[PDB]
Write a protein that binds this DNA or RNA. Structure first.
Ligand SMILES: [Zn+2]
Lengths: 49, 209, 78, 50, 199
RNA sequence: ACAGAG
DNA sequence: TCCAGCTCCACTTAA
DNA sequence: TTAAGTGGAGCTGGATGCTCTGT
């Protein structure tokens, strides 16, 4: 959620993303922007895609 | 004028000699060092001097590959050259069995003539130069590095040293002034020698495409 | 012969310590004698300095060939 | 930063692999010099120079 | 009236700061999207994601901007030799002459580990050592020093002193600092370029 | 949708 | 509020 | 005389910084 009233949390913006790329920090960028936000699993059919 | 007009016909001719020398045509030491006050002797001022057919060059044979591989340079007098004048130069070129020519136009070329040079023949290739480009030898300009057209046996080492394909090299256009100057075609590679800030050099490569 | 640089890069060092810390966090054998350290990343740094880490770094050239370098035979540096 | 009611963000990496990449690559001791011209940015400031 | 004009000149700095956010943040976003794919490869090349080449060697040297001890150059030889003289002064060793310095330098520089350097860097060291060797001659000519070490007021050998141990430690420090200053494979070199022009 | 803060 | 592509229409060459 | 390739002019659609803190 969006902010302090809603106990929202903080944003890793498009600019913070550019910082972490320049460090070569590939796993931290995966942890921050996938694992600690919105990790999910989908069933994908390999035949029709 | 007349002082200024002869100056162009000397500088243009001087650059064409260096252009033909850099392409590897047989050029003599007295052609490259032809001085202004020496130019005045074979052809003088404008009434005696003739532009369309006196300053033409055909002595240029490709002395490396073969003395039968030969090239013209032509200096039209009409500022916009029509297909008629092209057909005139083409049939003269057909008679001599020469396959390359340079046409040095004074102001431009009409669109239907430009289209002809693409399709007249792959075995009869003609290159448009504007004289305003030839008044300054761009290979001696301070921003232009040394370009060196690579041999197939050296391209095969470049691609072996880095394990590349040809289509991963950087590109250079055929419409580039320095590509036109050396007359290179699609699939040739140019070595480029960039100067360092130090005494050293950096070597880079480009593909014509 | 192996043509690539003998020095361990900071990216190789970061990921070896990371993967070894994750393996020491799970119940893997520790190759050094630990001395009351609890933090897995601190134990992995002792194993790197002692050259005991059992990881091979497969350097990849862009054409698809590879070089297998041992972590113990790269020159480590700060 | 200038300590005039400034706010800053904090993130806690939730993974052992994310600790190591943060510590080795993004640590302050590994980043004393800016990438740009190679000049030090973590150094003394007012009342430490005076 | 003076206060009003000073307030006019002041607001143009306030208004520049209020504009500078929108004036620059869009510029940096464009730079990053263009440059972010560029990575320095293990074969010392810079390639895009599709595998085309942007550069055959990064920056012409292969060297890392963050490691430059000089103005865009990896070392500063005057500083490095002074450091080695002061950390390792060798009072029990002779001071080398012009010819003995050149001879001992080319004995060390032909060892196998120096072959891994770029030839431009080996020339700069030899150019520097030749420069140092000429200062020794000029001083020893002025003061009448004899290269055999026999001259009685021994303080003269302090003037341009250099010892074999200091030459050996100098060449190792230079060669090490060059190898550690190379742009390491994997480096996200486009993102550093983007931010270094944007900031 | 507006005001703030850095 | 500023700026690249796309399309319509006069303007010479050429047969 | 006109078929056609290319100049110049107007129309159209895109874009314009990062966050929390409240009503
Ligand atoms: Zn399916």
């Amino acid at each position: 959620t969006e902010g302090r009233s809603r106990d929202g949390g903080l944003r890793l913006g498009e600019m913070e993303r550019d910082c972490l790329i320049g460090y070569g920090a590939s796993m931290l960028l995966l942890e921050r922007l996938m694992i600690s936000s919105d990790a999910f699993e989908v069933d994908v059919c390999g035949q029709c895609g | 004028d007349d002082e200024e007009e002869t100056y162009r016909l000397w500088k243009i001719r001087k650059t064409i000699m260096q252009l033909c020398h850099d392409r590897g045509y047989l050029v003599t030491q007295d052609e490259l060092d032809q001085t202004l006050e020496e130019f005045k002797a074979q052809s003088g001022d404008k009434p005696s001097e003739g532009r369309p057919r006196r300053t033409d060059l055909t002595v240029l044979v490709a002395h490396n590959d073969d003395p039968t591989d030969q090239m013209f340079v032509f200096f039209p007098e009409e500022p916009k050259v029509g297909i008629k004048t092209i057909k005139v130069y083409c049939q003269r070129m057909q008679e001599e069995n020469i396959t390359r020519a340079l046409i040095v136009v004074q102001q431009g070329m009409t669109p239907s003539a430009k289209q002809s040079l693409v399709d007249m023949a792959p075995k009869y290739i003609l290159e448009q130069f504007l004289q305003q480009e030839l008044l300054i030898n761009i290979t001696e300009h301070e921003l232009v590095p040394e370009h060196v057209v690579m041999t197939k046996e050296e391209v095969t080492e470049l691609l072996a040293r880095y394990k590349l394909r040809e289509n991963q090299l950087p590109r250079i256009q055929a419409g580039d002034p320095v590509a036109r100057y050396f007359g290179i075609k699609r699939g040739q590679v140019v070595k480029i020698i960039r100067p360092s800030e130090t005494a050293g050099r950096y070597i880079t490569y480009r593909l014509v495409q | 012969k192996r043509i690539t640089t003998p020095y361990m890069t900071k990216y190789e060092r970061a990921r070896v310590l990371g993967t070894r810390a994750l393996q020491i966090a799970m119940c893997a054998p520790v190759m050094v004698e630990l001395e009351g350290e609890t933090d897995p990343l601190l134990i992995a740094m002792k194993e790197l300095k002692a050259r005991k880490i059992p990881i091979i770094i497969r350097r990849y050239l862009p054409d698809g060939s590879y070089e297998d370098w041992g972590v113990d035979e790269l020159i480590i540096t700060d | 930063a200038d300590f005039d009611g400034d706010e800053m963000n904090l993130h806690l990496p939730q993974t052992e692999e994310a600790k190591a990449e943060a510590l080795v690559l993004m640590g302050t001791k590994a980043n004393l010099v800016t990438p740009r011209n190679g000049e030090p940015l973590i150094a003394a400031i007012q009342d430490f120079l005076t | 009236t003076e206060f009003f004009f000073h307030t006019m000149a002041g607001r143009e700095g306030l208004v520049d700061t209020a504009v500078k956010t929108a004036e620059t943040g869009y510029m940096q976003r464009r730079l990053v999207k263009s440059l972010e794919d560029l990575c320095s490869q293990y074969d010392l090349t810079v390639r895009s994601s599709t595998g085309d080449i942007i550069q055959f060697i990064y920056g012409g040297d292969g060297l890392d901007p963050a490691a430059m001890e000089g103005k865009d150059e990896p070392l500063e030889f005057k500083r490095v030799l002074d450091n080695i003289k002061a950390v390792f002064p060798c009072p029990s060793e002779p001071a080398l002459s012009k010819n003995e310095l050149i001879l001992t330098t080319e004995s060390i520089m032909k060892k196998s580990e120096f072959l891994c350097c770029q030839d431009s860097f080996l020339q700069e060291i030899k150019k520097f050592i030749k420069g140092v060797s000429e200062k020794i001659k000029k001083t020893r000519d002025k003061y009448g020093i004899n290269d055999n070490g026999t001259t009685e007021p021994r303080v003269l050998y302090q003037l341009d002193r250099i010892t074999p141990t200091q030459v050996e430690k100098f060449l190792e420090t230079c060669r090490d600092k060059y190898m550690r200053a190379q742009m390491e494979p994997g480096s996200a070199v486009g993102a550093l370029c983007a931010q270094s022009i944007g900031e």
